[PDB]
Amino acid sequence: TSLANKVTDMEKLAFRGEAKDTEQKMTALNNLLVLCRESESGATGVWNQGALVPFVLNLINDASENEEVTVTAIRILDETIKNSVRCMKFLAMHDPDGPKSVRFVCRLMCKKSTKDFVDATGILVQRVFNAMAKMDRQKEMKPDPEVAEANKIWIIRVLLELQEMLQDPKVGAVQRETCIDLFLKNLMHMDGGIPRGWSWKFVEERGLLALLDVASQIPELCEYPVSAETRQHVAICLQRLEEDMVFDTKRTIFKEKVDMFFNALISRCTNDDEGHKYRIKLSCFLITMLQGPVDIGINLITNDQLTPIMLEMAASQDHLMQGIAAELIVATVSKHERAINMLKVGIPVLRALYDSEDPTVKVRALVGLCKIGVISLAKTCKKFLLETEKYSVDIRRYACEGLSYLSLDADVKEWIVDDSLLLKALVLLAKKAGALCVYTLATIYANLSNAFEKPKVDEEMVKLAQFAHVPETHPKDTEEYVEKRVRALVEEGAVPACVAVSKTESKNALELIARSLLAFAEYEDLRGRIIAEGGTVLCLRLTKEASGEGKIKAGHAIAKLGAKADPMISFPGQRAYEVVKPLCDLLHPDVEGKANYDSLLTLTNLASVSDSIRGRILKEKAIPKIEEFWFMTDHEHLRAAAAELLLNLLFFEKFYEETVAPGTDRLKLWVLYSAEVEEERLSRASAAGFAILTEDENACARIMDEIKSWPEVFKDIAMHEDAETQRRGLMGIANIMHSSNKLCSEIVSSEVFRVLVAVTKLXXXXXXXXXXXXXX
């Protein structure tokens, strides 16, 4: 009950009214947040047989309450409901009836409208999917199809609630975006979500049609709160659904639903004033197509009825319809040349739309010209981006899109870096617009470190063509120029712009960020600074929630950050514990990036702090991964780092005894690696670990009987070239004869006895041998 008394103290100071100051209540909250996050017993005591949730719910219903206080209560509650027992008890505890308690939890995001509150409520619904299917996107934990169908009736209640909230006009835009992010993360089994057939039921049901209505929206024309940030949340989850319809029976069915939606819209494309807005919703739809499931929409681009309606709304006198046509046709330009089958005619059209002076039309007319790139267009975007107070963030998003399309040229990149106040504009963009511009800003960082071509898989064949005068390499992609670009970007703060746009799910763009971060951590002087701005929080979240292709680079960037770092400053606690899972999955010897040595140096720094660090590594089946690098003969950086890792990992009690255990043949290599003693890197480890292993008597007996031809090894480490390897080894031999006298009896009768007595007459092993002599 000392637990039960220490939750009573923090209980009165949070809920039962013991506070004459806000920050001391914040102190009790931050104490409980640490307290529940440290043990499961914290989540037991704070639960208090369910006494927690009503205190919190009467806290949320304050209009006078600070933001960070309430969000702190949620940061406790979602940690509380990580138990599957407690969360399922929580789910229906808000109504004797089932589905109204379901809707009461789903409408918890509509209490307030700050971005932080809505992102933490989406963590609350996330932990529910983690309670039902027993799945985890954070720990790559697959669901159990046993327990999914065991409580299917709860799930259908939830899906109805969500597809109710998607067309519920009483719900604001930032919350509706967060619902869509829950469909992206937790639904798809291709993304490790709800299993097969579930998404087939959703398509067979009317929820897909709700999403198609949502893609046909804008903040300017809506029936319900939509922001411009919403569409990029829609288009990804639509492409992820296309990634989840694995059978061509179902892709047949998917094309069959969406054509009914489309042809109903074109049945409603009339010239009437009612009929204009269906043309505008078609324009909002097709751009949402091209941003995501590019594949289906081009099959609808070949429909030839489209482009005269594009001309009608361009000749219309409403400027909203013309600005939306500009951003339509600029999304039409693809990497498929049959888009030009529609696009070959509209080339001068936007060339005319720049001539109009409406700026909302103008910046959308500026992009695309940026796509087909000529340095004067960069001079023009220069004009829009530097103007901050006058222009809105909705306009200044499009200039970033135009400049990312301009950043394909190598020579314009240098003109970009020569500006500093541009970057001042970039940080004041990302920290004011938040996560609004992620595809494009990451597209720029990829172009700056040349991270698109960072898959240099084709350069191996290009130099095979050079094995046979004609081509043109370009000098602005030389390693020194990129070192200039990158040191300029780190000097003017790319990292806080990265974490402010990190609140999305865009694996296209989150790939582009990981690729840029990997080139950023190439140099050691700035990576401590990158860590100083929270880059570790960023990279770990990246390797948890990016594209699977980007996770290799994400963990590799994590590996470069912590190579020779002090891990206590660079990784506090919970941040350190989750480090093990990503990089142990990167150790594939058949891959062999220059990541493996970075991996092992990181882990060896990690293994020196605490037992909970090094214990969680063995659970990850790291040991068979480390042994194969430790079996290698050719490499030098790898095997000694695996040895120094395995040097530090013998502090763990159980691993110390797994090596002494009779099933393994590892103690052979701990001494034979002191014998092939051409180098000092591996010999120093295999003699220090030997000095640790031989303090145990049963470990000494397994040396002699299990090693044929052993005194040859000991005479080699006695008549020894290096001095440090030899002196560590001799104390690990000194404790042998201290242990058992029958083994020491097999030492005087052996060959090595004469060189042992030879060395004592010359440093530290001298009195070790003298101690050995006392046995007789």
Numbering used by the authors: 136 to 508, 525 to 619, 622 to 915, 926 to 939
From the primary publication:
Subsequent studies in C. elegans, Xenopus, Zebrafish, and Drosophila confirmed the role of UNC-45 as a myosin-specific chaperone, promoting the folding of the myosin ATPase domain as well as coordinating the assembly of thick filaments during muscle development. To better understand its myosin folding function, we established an orthogonal protein folding assay in insect cells, characterizing the interplay of the C. elegans muscle myosin MHC-B with its cognate chaperone UNC-45. Structural data of various functional mutants clarify the role of the distinct UNC-45 domains in this process providing important mechanistic insight into its myosin folding activity.
Surprisingly, however, deleting the entire TPR domain fully abolished the chaperone function of UNC-45. Accordingly, the TPR domain does not only serve as Hsp70/Hsp90 docking site, but accomplishes further critical functions. Finally, we determined the crystal structure of the UNC-45 ∆TPR construct that represents a C. elegans UNC-45 variant in monomeric, non-filamentous form. The asymmetric unit of the ∆TPR crystal form is built up by two molecules. In molecule A, the UCS domain adopts an extended conformation similar to wt UNC-45, whereas molecule B contains a UCS domain that is strongly bent, with the entire domain and even more strongly its C-terminal half (ARM repeats 14–17) extending away from the central domain. These data further highlight the pronounced structural flexibility of the myosin-binding UCS domain, which is held in place by non-covalent interactions with the adjacent central and TPR domains. Accordingly, deleting the TPR domain releases the flexible UCS domain to adopt various conformations, two of which were captured in the present crystal form. (2) Our structural data suggest that the TPR domain obtains an additional intra-molecular scaffolding role. It undergoes van-der-Waals contacts with the UCS domain, thereby arranging the myosin binding site to accommodate substrate. Our structural data reveal the capability of the UCS domain to adopt distinct defined conformations. Together, the wt, G427E, L822F, and ∆TPR crystal structures depict four different UCS conformations highlighting the pronounced dynamicity of the myosin-binding domain.
